[PDB]
Amino acid sequence: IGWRREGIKYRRNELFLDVLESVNLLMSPQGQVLSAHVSGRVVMKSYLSGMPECKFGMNDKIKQSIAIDDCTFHQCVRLSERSISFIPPDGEFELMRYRTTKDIILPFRVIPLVREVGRTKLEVKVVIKSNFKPSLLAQKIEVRIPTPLNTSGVQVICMKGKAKYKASENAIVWKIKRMAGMKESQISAEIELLPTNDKKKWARPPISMNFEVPFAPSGLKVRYLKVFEPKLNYSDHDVIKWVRYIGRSGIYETRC
């Protein structure tokens, strides 16, 4: 086996899995999801004794059960429910890579509201809502609200987080360190406008977010990682096993 040498021993047989997903979304002003998908990989870190034969199972019949549009594996994987089998390399490696479009969890919903006030002001309210177990925290949230090019200034109020108006980037940026499942937050801004060429209207680009969440928005869950080394005297239960999910936004736009 050219990916794993032959005499590895560890007193503490222990492995680590990372399910890394990036969630993507294009949503219309009327709440319809125009397009959405998730890309993910599973990375494993293993410090197991021998040349063990592991079995990776997750929620894929296709409660909990998810549908994978496609995916590729690491050579060590023996192709042929029917689950994934391999003798992994030692250390850290990319077990599989996958894609997904159905029954995806959109961790965040964004609700924009905008009010034209004569020719001087825009009034904008934006609400974000977290869609997930309240026991879970999202971290590193940013909402990004574009302003027209004739903005002379911006005032905003927001009871959670901080938001700076950023002229170079032509956007209001709201940042929240942590926020829990099933909650709501909002921001209000008033945008003061220079005069402009009446004729060319403003093309409102989407409001966009960045966030990181501790679960796989594809819904994928790890169920088991069975280890078997037949020559040596450690069994599956001897193995300490950890798993952790890091879901993050890719592109996540909402049109107003």
Partner: peptide, 9 residues
């Protein structure tokens, strides 16, 4: 913390 490991199994 996001990025924290959970035991399973």
């Amino acid at each position: 913390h996001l990025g924290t490991y959970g035991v399973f199994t």
